[PDB]
């Protein structure tokens, strides 16, 4: 309907399982959020609920009076976090998708003036990657800028890593990508 | 230390809209959500449904608890409503654009609350309604939300696009422009 400006009221519940070194160390953080303010949380390093704001104090007190809820939450690092890690490991933790790497100049400008060379690294997973530029085999760092890591929302990432150059005839520029999906670096050259 | 991972079960209930959500996230990507109308698990990548299962009925019972808890909290706060936080919007493509080679326009809407937004793609000023898909509201550590909308398309240097976003926090529709240059 048009003209709907009624006040809104929001409640969020978040259960976060944090994993360190496979599942050797696991921490559960259960968070309640009213509007934009977290009001109460269960942290498995504490083992009981704690008020984050005064609004949450009644719930921390009430939930901490419940033996069953507390015992269930104290065991949840195993029954929930480690369980779900095991369910999803093979297609999440172990997911590997190789990027497609392309190089192109940013605009058509004459040699011996400034240009930006673009190394596009598309479609990879997980997000840890190293993208570096070389000129005639020597690394270039001062003139490098990037989009940063872009999450596409579809379990792939992309990034552009750009090099400001003054290209001279005969020079070879290389973009080199290292990523857990490949056993040797990917390299793409552009010849001035 | 990208040797850490995080799985989040994130849920919400919003009044007076009567809108719920239930999703799991792994390292910032959605594993699945429960469609609240069809009452079913929707895997973010279809093949995940060949590798794992989930029981949506239990998730839907949690949403009944979340609605009751929202009603309690709304009263307990003396009916304090949410402060709107408007989105920021970025348009990008799945991959570098080449003339007439199929691609996807991505409208990424970020840093907003409450989780209600109207998103329309415009081509040459006119709404493009079908072919689009969209994600549910994805959680952020600051308890705002983000969201992706996707439009498969054929790049042309003559077309222009806008992702038009309406939200209570905005004074006027936000129009994020995109076009392919020669």
């Amino acid at each position: 309907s048009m003209g709907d400006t009624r006040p809104r009221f929001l409640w969020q519940l978040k259960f976060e399982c944090h994993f360190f070194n496979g599942t050797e160390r696991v921490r559960l953080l259960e968070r309640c959020i009213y509007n934009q303010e977290e009001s109460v949380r269960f942290d498995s390093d504490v083992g009981e609920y704690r008020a984050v704001t005064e609004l949450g104090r009644p719930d921390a007190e009430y939930w901490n009076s419940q033996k069953d809820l507390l015992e269930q939450r104290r065991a949840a690092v195993d029954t929930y976090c480690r369980h779900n890690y095991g369910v999803g490991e093979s297609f999440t933790v172990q997911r590997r998708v190789e990027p497609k790497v392309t190089v192109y100049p940013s605009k058509t400008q004459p040699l011996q003036h400034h240009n930006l060379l673009v190394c596009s690294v598309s479609g990879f997973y997980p997000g840890s990657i190293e993208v570096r530029w070389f000129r005639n085999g020597q690394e270039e760092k001062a003139g490098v800028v990037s989009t940063g890591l872009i999450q596409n929302g579809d379990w792939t990432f992309q990034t552009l890593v750009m090099l400001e150059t003054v290209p001279r005839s005969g020079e070879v520029y290389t973009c080199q990508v290292e990523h857990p999906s490949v056993t040797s670096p990917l390299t793409v050259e552009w010849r001035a | 230390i990208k040797e850490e991972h995080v799985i989040i079960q994130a849920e919400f209930y919003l009044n007076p809209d009567q809108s719920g959500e239930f999703m799991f996230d792994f390292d910032g990507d959605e594993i699945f959500h429960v469609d609240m109308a069809k009452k079913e698990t929707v895997w973010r990548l279809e093949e995940f449904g060949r590798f794992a299962s989930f029981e949506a009925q239990g998730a839907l019972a949690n949403i009944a608890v979340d609605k009751a808890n929202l009603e309690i909290m709304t009263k307990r706060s003396n009916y304090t409503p949410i402060t709107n936080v408007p989105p920021e919007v970025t348009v990008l493509t799945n991959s570098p654009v080449e003339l007439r080679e199929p691609n996807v326009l991505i409208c990424f809407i970020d840093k907003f609350t409450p989780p209600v937004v109207n998103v329309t793609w415009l081509r040459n000023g006119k709404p493009v309604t079908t072919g689009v898909s969209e994600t549910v509201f994805l959680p952020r550590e600051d308890h705002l939300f983000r969201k992706f909308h996707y439009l498969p398309f054929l790049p042309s240097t003559e077309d222009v696009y806008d992702c038009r976003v309406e939200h209570w926090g905005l004074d006027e529709p936000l129009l994020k422009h995109w076009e392919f240059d020669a």
């Binding site: 519940l13 259960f15 259960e30 309640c32 009644p58 719930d59 007190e61 009430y62 939930w63 419940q66 809820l69 939450r73 949840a76 029954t79 929930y80 369980h83 779900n84 095991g86 369910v87 999803g88 | 079960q9 849920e11 799991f24 594993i31 699945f32 060949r50 590798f51 794992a52 299962s53 989930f54 029981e55 239990g58 998730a59 019972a61 949690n62 608890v65 979340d66 009751a68 808890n69 309690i72 909290m73």
Partner: peptide
């Protein structure tokens, strides 16, 4: 296949 499990939400205090 294996099943992801959820944590159930407790009722806040009236």
């Amino acid at each position: 296949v294996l099943s992801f499990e959820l944590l159930h939400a407790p009722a806040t205090v009236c």
